[PDB]
Symmetry: D2
Subunit: 221 residues, 4 copies
């Protein structure tokens, strides 16, 4: 389909949002590099599920907050598929390290390969003051990277989800759930699939000529 013969790396893709994003890209025809902890019980199961659905998938085990694991991830992608068309960066000190620093390291490593291709899409997914600074940081980073690599044909955009349906939100007390729901103009939580569909758009040719942008998927919040 839309991403036939392309390779997408999705960080933090063993479960939840990352898995849904990788699932959508896989079903658009992309070769998938899943990423997660070596200690993940779900990582291997997820890969087998993808393969059974007809998605070509390799697994890079490690923590993308560490340079050595980032290098491994890139090497397993290249060994498997020989190219990287799409990087999805999905993931006080611990907060800025987890979200923002992983995005920085992965972008730095993958950009080397995208520059040789003269092609590539980098899509950053955003995750109180610690989170706010990290989120805004990732957006500024996005816009900076977009500006820097625009001349070379490489895209960088961000997706900023509002409140998305999780295992936690499902078990929310009805009163605390109604308080959040009442603060969202659309009066419902978003879904992992909706976020995945927006990343699908940003990965496809349908989003050509869009760079340095943030798409808020938050129900008008």
């Amino acid at each position: 389909m839309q991403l036939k013969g392309k390779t997408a790396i999705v960080t933090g893709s063993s479960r939840g949002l990352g898995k849904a994003i990788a699932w959508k890209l896989g079903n658009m025809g992309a070769n998938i590099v899943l990423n997660g902890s070596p200690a993940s019980t779900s990582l291997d199961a997820t890969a087998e599920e993808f393969k059974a659905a007809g998605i070509n998938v390799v697994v890079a085990k490690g923590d993308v907050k560490n340079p050595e694991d980032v290098e491994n991830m890139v090497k397993t992608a290249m060994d498997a598929f020989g190219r990287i068309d799409i990087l999805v960066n999905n993931a006080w000190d611990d907060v800025l390290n987890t979200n923002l620093k992983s995005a920085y390291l992965c972008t730095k490593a993958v950009s080397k390969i995208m520059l040789k291709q003269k092609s590539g899409k980098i899509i950053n997914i955003t995750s109180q003051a610690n989170y706010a600074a990290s989120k805004a940081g990732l957006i500024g980073f996005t816009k900076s990277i977009a500006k820097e690599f625009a001349a070379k044909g490489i895209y960088c955009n961000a997706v900023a989800p509002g409140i998305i349906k999780t295992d936690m939100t499902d078990v929310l007390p009805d009163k605390v759930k109604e308080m959040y729901l009442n603060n969202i103009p659309l009066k419902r939580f978003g879904t992992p699939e909706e976020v995945a569909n927006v990343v699908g758009f940003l990965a496809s040719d349908d989003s050509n000529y869009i760079t340095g942008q943030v798409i808020n998927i938050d129900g008008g919040l």
Copy 2:
């Protein structure tokens, strides 16, 4: 395909960007209501082209800056297809009347029908101080409408194109063209098809849960 059995009204769709937008929506399976001046030489030709390509199309002739023509447009849509799922608003006194006032009147008229459906997507396309105020006005209008109709399931978003390939840009002197190109990070003009693809995204279920947003398609400008 994605918009099978849905009806899209695209204002100013006899030629250029509007025609490209209507073409994309048509090819996604939507019933199309084209709009343009009764004096258009291209309007009828465009409709025949769409029909030959297998797109179900009706034509509403008039100027959408006038209430009576807006009512006609809505009536021809309803007479033809019985519903309106998508409105694309594409188009000192003359500046604010052409862009912004047409968007206001069409939204007001179509919103009545979308409220009964409890479903609908309104997509506003932006067009020196006169243009700047109009553009910013249309964006504020977009965000206001989104907030107002969110509770009822109706979406409102905007697409803001930068410099797009036209008949005018093609005949631009090479020096004036190079001056514009050098001010765009991606170092090329956008295309009508690219804008059409973004409207395609905003019209489809892939953009569910996104409201009150502006997508800049400007090559990082």
Copy 3:
């Protein structure tokens, strides 16, 4: 004081916010041109109050939504003081005409004089979809004018007040008042004097090098 020997025109300054703005500028040492309807009972009283406080004041009677009255206003300023250093623009068809069109006409007229001076500060004060489009329009207009006249030393900025204390807010039912107050992080309404103080800043040399900006004075709303 700070504005000694300078002339400020404040539109809609017979009462309320405009009067408070003109009062602050007057007390900073500026020559003041008050503006209001010929039918104003308060305009003359306000001018006499200013004079008794030691402020040099002239009155331009008319509606600044009309070109002829705009010309009169400019002429009474020039006849009185021979220069214009500061213009404060304070004020579906009726909405866009009142706020935005007055700002456009006054700026156009005053800019001719500021260009000869190679000096000047234009400060636009913002006033549901009609209001939202008008407000956003005035902001886009502000940014456009700033860009256009930057090379010539002329500044353009905007002040965007949130909920400000009025005669209407004072008589608000306690329950409707508590609903608004609870939606403002600072948990109080703003005052006309606070807005006036921000305009005072934008009129003074303390705001040199700031152009094309909007200052939100809304208690974090």
Copy 4:
């Protein structure tokens, strides 16, 4: 004057922008806590200059990227003046640590005292991808802190300078200088005094009711 009997802490205030900011606040009548490295040749000279000008000044020596020095700074302020009304936060791992982490630690420490006062103003001064993320991070942090402490009367705003006159810019080659100047609508660099004047505004009662805002002082850039 405006800040009589108030205490302002200005981080990184031994020289340059920080010194100019502290100078302005001092001359508005504030008690000043200067901050800089124990190895600073200029810190002591600067304090003596302030004292000779009639400014009440104490010096906190240390690096505000370290918790122990932040505690010292707060303790020297409290020992000297018994209160803190104004904190000015002025200053890949090294980039995020220098700008953003110092702002975080100082705000955290000073906020404890401001909460007891139920009064306080925190003013963050912004400093390629590393800088962009840090700058955007500090802005998001600002907005978060403002939201968090609004209920308690504590303000948080940011100042974002564009290109400001330094010792480096003065010795810039004329061609590289003309390239920067041509990219600024006002066609000149800003000055440390201009930045200081904006902080002066944000420290004074003239900026009451403004919170969670960023003032760009960049000549329209």
